[PDB]
């Protein structure tokens, strides 16, 4: 009766079902966990918000078209405005979190296409001016739940002030490496003939036990159309991709007044 | 070495000291606690924010003058805009909390005066129009950290629409009972010759295990000048009263989107 | 509903409510649907991003035809009243497309689901009363 | 002849009954019967359905 295709995930007051999954990935074979006393750093008693924040938050959906080049988000950035997770994040200097990432995209037995879904530690991307290096604004690096998109062209700016955004060039993974090698990162593929969802469970990954969430994104989430969407009755059709993410084993230190980042 | 006058209280990242206390009150002899399974009601796993919210928050200070008639606050109303406590309060349908209330008022060995500090369960107060009964607006009932003041005169409104506030008449405790009997409620006195602070530890008190914090205040805090402030070199002098309150054993159920109450 | 009719012979109710949904499109139709229960006291949800902050389930349409969403017992009072009443308000149930329903050609593009309600084993009622659902002339 | 039984609890014991009549139809209400089997209406299926398993396999 039980199947690699059928799964339920419950966190807090939220549950996901899927009937066309393809197993699930646990990044680097490691489930998230709380920070042990023998690896701890800040000494204040941490806040562990548990069910208030460790639950599924669904981002705005994006549309997959035959011309789409792909999508990216950063974490914890994408969830910074999400319920009590966002509040705990911004009221504290330090935070750590794992995640369950659930990417959703259904179609029909007559559609075709394949999405690569990658979780990338320290997903540093190229800037869009050749007058400077590493020249990206905080606002452009941290778009929040809207994330960003890839392009198949690189057109760096004429003036440095106008190029302070990512050059998210698809085939170079926005960072000077070939996209065909992205499979070295934890990943699944949503191949429409096979499955309608991808599930990745991510431990906290960093060179530190805990860090400043408002300064530093630990993971990138990349969705690339490896094989273009095609549907014979209407090649211009669009199907939604929906991203739902739950923080896990969240832990925060260094409580004070709330952080309100710059918006422009 | 140890003394009834000298105390330290630490909750979360916050500590209070006093060197002229007068013991401390534990209301009805009961320390606050979490809600036991055998008395529980809502069935969702609760959020217990612990150190993020169970910590001392200091309200805006008020000035005690020879003409002051007194001050009131409600709880959890007075703390609704306080850090992560306020966030947890408003993101949930249900909440419960105990409190440590620490009232602070120092002067000199040459000043005199006495403040009664009372914690009142279900502190229902009279309205200020005789055209209606129980006719108080949500906004006037819930002033937040600014609280309200008592008056020594009762002047109900000419029109019902203008009297939708409390008639906080001092000698009737704003509710039709004689203020001299307020000592049946948990209390201390700040008598300037003796002490400079009052400390009251309050359990959750209600006819329910847990309730809607945004609808219902469990406690009133009343500060009444029982003996007027006097200072011979300047009878018009003013000394601050500062109220610092820590939620304790906070527990919340029924997570959803954030409650944003009406402001006018 | 059957539950509603029984409740109207009582004054008080308590417990969890079960909402089960049966998708009745064609086998070729796929989709993901969000079903949510938001306990009361905040802005009623009219968008998916508010609804998903409450108790919810994401239903993937497929071979298993039906999905159950629970409104768990989450209340201030130990019983709610079997009347419209602000004090014992129960909150908000909503539903949104999580992705969308997708069909291939030669397939109906509109269809239906059926919603059912029932009480859970934690559910009970008190205080027998006459119903307002039956009457006669005199 | 006297039956002693537990009362339904109130705000904050036992009670005694004696039947006075020769016909059981004369008796007071039947004692509380908490018997139930909702499954005869909620799950009257021939083959057992395990909740955690697929309903259709």
């Amino acid at each position: 009766g039980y199947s690699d295709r059928v799964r339920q995930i419950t966190l807090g007051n939220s549950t996901i079902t899927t009937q066309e999954a393809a197993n699930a990935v646990v990044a680097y074979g490691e489930w998230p966990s709380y920070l042990d006393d023998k690896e701890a750093n800040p000494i204040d008693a941490p806040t562990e918000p548990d069910v208030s924040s460790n639950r599924f938050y669904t981002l705005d959906s994006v549309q997959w078209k035959s011309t789409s080049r792909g999508w990216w988000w950063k974490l914890p950035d994408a969830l910074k405005d999400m319920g009590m997770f966002g509040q705990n994040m911004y009221y504290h200097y330090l935070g750590r979190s794992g995640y369950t990432v659930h990417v959703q995209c259904n179609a029909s037995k007559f559609h075709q296409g394949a999405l690569g879904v990658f979780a990338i530690p320290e997903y540093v991307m190229a800037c869009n001016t050749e007058a400077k290096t590493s020249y990206v604004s905080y606002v452009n690096a941290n778009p929040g739940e809207k994330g960003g998109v890839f392009d198949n062209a690189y057109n760096p700016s004429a003036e440095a002030s106008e190029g302070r955004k990512f050059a998210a060039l698809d085939y170079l993974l926005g960072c000077g490496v070939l996209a065909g090698n992205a499979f070295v990162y934890p990943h699944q593929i949503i191949n429409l003939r096979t499955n309608n969802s991808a599930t990745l469970v991510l431990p906290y990954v960093n060179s530190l036990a805990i860090d400043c969430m408002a300064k530093h994104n630990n993971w990138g989430l990349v969705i690339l159309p490896l094989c273009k969407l095609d549907y014979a009755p209407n090649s211009s059709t669009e199907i939604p991709i929906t991203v739902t993410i739950a923080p896990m084993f969240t832990e925060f230190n260094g409580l004070r007044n709330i952080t309100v980042p710059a918006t422009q | 070495g140890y003394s009834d006058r000298v105390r330290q209280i630490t909750l979360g990242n916050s500590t209070i000291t006093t060197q002229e206390a007068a013991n401390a009150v534990v209301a009805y002899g009961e320390w606050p606690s979490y809600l036991d399974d055998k008395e529980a009601n809502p069935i969702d796993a609760p959020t217990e924010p612990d150190v993020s919210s169970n910590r001392f928050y200091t309200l805006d200070s008020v000035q005690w003058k020879s003409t002051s008639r007194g001050w009131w606050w409600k709880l959890p109303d007075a703390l609704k805009d306080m850090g992560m406590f306020g966030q947890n309060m408003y993101y949930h349908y249900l909440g419960r909390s105990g409190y440590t209330v620490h009232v602070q008022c120092n002067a000199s060995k040459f000043h005199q005066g006495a403040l009664g500090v009372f914690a009142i369960p279900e502190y229902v107060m009279a309205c200020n129009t005789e055209a209606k009964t129980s006719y108080v607006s949500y906004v006037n009932a819930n002033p937040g950290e600014k609280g309200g003041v008592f008056d020594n005169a009762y002047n109900p409104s000419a029109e019902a629409s203008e009297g939708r506030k409390f008639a906080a008449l001092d000698y009737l405790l704003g509710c039709g009972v004689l203020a001299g009997n307020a000592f049946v409620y948990p209390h201390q006195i700040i008598n300037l010759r003796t002490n400079n602070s009052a400390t009251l530890v309050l359990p959750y008190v209600n006819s329910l295990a847990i309730d809607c914090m945004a609808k219902h205040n469990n406690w009133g805090l009343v500060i009444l000048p029982l003996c007027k402030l006097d200072y011979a070199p300047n009878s018009s002098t003013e000394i601050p009263i500062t109220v610092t309150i820590a939620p304790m054993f906070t527990e919340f159920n029924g997570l959803r989107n954030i409650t944003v109450p009406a402001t006018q | 509903t059957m539950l509603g009719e029984i409740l109207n012979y009582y004054t008080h109710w308590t417990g969890s409510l079960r909402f089960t949904f049966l998708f009745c499109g064609s086998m070729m139709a796929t989709g993901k649907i969000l079903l949510s229960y938001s306990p009361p006291g905040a802005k009623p949800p009219t968008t998916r991003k508010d609804a998903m902050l409450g108790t919810h389930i994401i239903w993937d349409l497929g071979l298993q035809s039906s999905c159950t969403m629970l409104a768990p017992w989450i209340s201030n009072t130990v019983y709610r009243r079997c009347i419209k009443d602000d004090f014992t308000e129960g909150g908000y149930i909503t539903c949104f497309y999580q992705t969308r329903i997708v069909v291939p050609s030669g397939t109906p593009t509109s269809m239906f689901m059926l919603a059912f309600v029932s009480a859970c084993p934690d559910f009970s009622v008190r205080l027998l009363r006459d119903t307002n659902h039956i009457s006669q002339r005199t | 002849g006297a039956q002693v039984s537990s009362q339904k609890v109130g705000a904050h014991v036992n009670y005694t009954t004696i039947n006075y009549y020769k016909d059981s139809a004369s008796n007071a209400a039947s004692k509380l019967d908490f018997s139930q089997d909702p499954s005869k209406f909620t799950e009257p299926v021939k083959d057992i359905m395990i909740k955690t398993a697929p309903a259709l396999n």
Binding site: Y2, V6, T17, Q19 | - | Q64, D122 | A55, L56
Partner: peptide, 27 residues
């Protein structure tokens, strides 16, 4: 006899899917 108590439970990530069923069965 009482109505049902609620047990302490956390989350799941599992091939057990009690949320789905098929009411065509008559259940």
């Amino acid at each position: 006899p009482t109505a049902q108590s609620t047990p302490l439970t956390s989350g799941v990530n599992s091939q057990e899917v009690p949320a789905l069923t098929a009411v065509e069965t008559g259940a």
